[PDB]
Amino acid sequence: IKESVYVKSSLFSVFIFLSFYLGCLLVGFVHYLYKIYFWNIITIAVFYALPVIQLVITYQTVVNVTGNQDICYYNFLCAHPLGVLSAFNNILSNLGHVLLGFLFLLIVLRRDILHRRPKHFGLFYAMGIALMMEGVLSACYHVCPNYSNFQFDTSFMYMIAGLCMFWVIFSAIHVLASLALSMDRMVLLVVGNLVNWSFALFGLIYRPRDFASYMLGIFICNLLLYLAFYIIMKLRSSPLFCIVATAVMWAAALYFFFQNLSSWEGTPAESREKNRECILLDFFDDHDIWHFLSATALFFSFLVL
Amino acid sequence: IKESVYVKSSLFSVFIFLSFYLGCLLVGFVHYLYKIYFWNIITIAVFYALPVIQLVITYQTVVNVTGNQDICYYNFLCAHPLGVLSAFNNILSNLGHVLLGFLFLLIVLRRDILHRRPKHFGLFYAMGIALMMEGVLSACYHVCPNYSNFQFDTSFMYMIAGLCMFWVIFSAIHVLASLALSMDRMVLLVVGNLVNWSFALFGLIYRPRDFASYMLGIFICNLLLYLAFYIIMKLRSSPLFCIVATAVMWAAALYFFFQNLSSWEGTPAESREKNRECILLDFFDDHDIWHFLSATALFFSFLVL
């Protein structure tokens, strides 16, 4: 494909979130008419990031010089090269993560500024920086996806889970964590325990090869349950468009997520069995669309928060 | 070589460090006649380590299966296999690091306990955990040394330097840092600035290919200068065997360090040009001896502290 589609796709990808900032600017104009944590998080992020970038760039160089293309588990039907990067679409598509995180950080910043002129935003700042780092490190992982660097991809989320605080054993421990985390209170508590136990038994029986998949699945299910709890309790106590947008963006996100176009758990030939052609602007594939809706649904859900 | 030399060498190492503990026990019997930082440090250490061992074990598995031995930069004359590890001597030799570190933690612990029954030990505990992690991660790096994981090797020391707070530009910035860190005060300050400047122009002219070596050298020289300052200033104000031992072990450690038997920055054949035969018990090489004396000189140096 010619560079014309390159520039069209890139311009569209940037300009959609540029229009998001533009609309936010109209909203603001219509309305017109704790550094220790920040320093620690920036140091930890930059220092942990540096050598994994070195590692992935070394992998890219060695695969480019050797020509042995089964080292990286790309989407070889929707792979577009530019310079030394042999898969640019998956790199550019993660721009939405960073831009949406920036918009989030700035709205939180102006909220704090207006507050100065238990409503705390420090955890919000930390989680926004977490979104920053997760997006960027996901991009670096997508430079060349392998078994080795997937652990580094989930290492930041493991870090965050640490700071914030065989399958039968896993199911039992998951059940224990679910019950420990959380006239009518007993009924809803039992309902939550039951829905958690259902995913526990799916994890026990199905036995997937991707642990992070179920980790994120229980994550999204638990936070959506808590959001439904918050909305129903607010209703019983006697803006709104974000609540509606959350559900549709997340529904699209899960649809695009459960495609599993690339699977590095097997041999690379088997991972090339599930490749699918480009579907968006002849430049993007299902995984990049998953990136986009994951970013926007994440933003909307935390906007409810 | 037979397993006999394996067991003799391993038993020798473990028993000499056990003799260190035993002598400490005689000393103690003769004398007889802040959790947030700990939790954070252990969490970050474990979580950052985990994918590093995952990556290096993946490297070991792939080199073992494909048989392409130029992936890892070993000491192929002093390489001894055991199980899946193809270089056991470099792994076992780092046992002294963790064992001496454990000694340091226990003596600090008894000192604190006696204190309960501005003398602060929190930084001492943090640096002891640092010793532990540096030793273990150096072992994991020595499983299969390459360009990629050397950055992870220096990553922990970069981490610590962050928490505790083109060559001409580097020399100028080094000079600025040296002068910013630190009748007769002027003369000694000028002397320190002069030796720092001499090392700065040494790095500027020689332009070494190992930045970590340069940083470690300036670290050793600076703390040696500060220790000599402490001794001379205590002398002017009107035990000692540790002070005596520090110099001898550190000089021998530098002697063994400047051998540079393996150099991954070139092609693997050039790194194999500088291989040297086993020298100690027909089981160890110069780098492992550097491991040992680095550990003991480290322990003695902060024993003075």
Numbering used by the authors:
A (entry chain B), B (entry chain A): 301 to 333, 441 to 524, 539 to 586, 628 to 644, 681 to 736, 743 to 809
Publication excerpt:
Human SIDT1 and SIDT2 are closely related members of the SID-1 transmembrane family, and have been implicated in various biological processes such as glucose and lipid metabolism, innate immunity, and tumorigenesis. Here, we present the cryo-electron microscopy (cryo-EM) structures of human SIDT1 and SIDT2. Both structures reveal an overall architecture of a dimeric arrangement composed of an extracellular domain (ECD) rich in β-strands and a transmembrane domain (TMD) with 11 passes, highlighting the remarkable structural congruence. Importantly, the ECDs of SIDT1 and SIDT2 bind synthetic plant-derived miRNA only under acidic conditions.
The TMDs of both proteins consist of 11 transmembrane helices and feature two pairs of conserved disulfide bonds that are essential for structural integrity. Notably, both SIDT1 and SIDT2 exhibit a potential zinc-binding site with three histidine residues within TMDs, which is responsible for lipid hydrolytic activity. Regarding the TMD, while the overall arrangement is similar in both SIDT1 and SIDT2, different transmembrane helices (TMs) contribute to dimerization. In SIDT1, the dimer interface primarily involves TM2 interacting with TM5 from the other protomer and is driven by extensive hydrophobic interactions. TM6 does not appear to play a significant role in the SIDT1 dimer interface. The electron density maps exhibited well-defined main-chain connectivity and side-chain densities in the ECDs, while the TMDs have relatively lower quality and resolution. The truncated TMD proteins also exhibited GFP fluorescence, suggesting that the TMD alone is sufficient for dimerization or oligomerization.
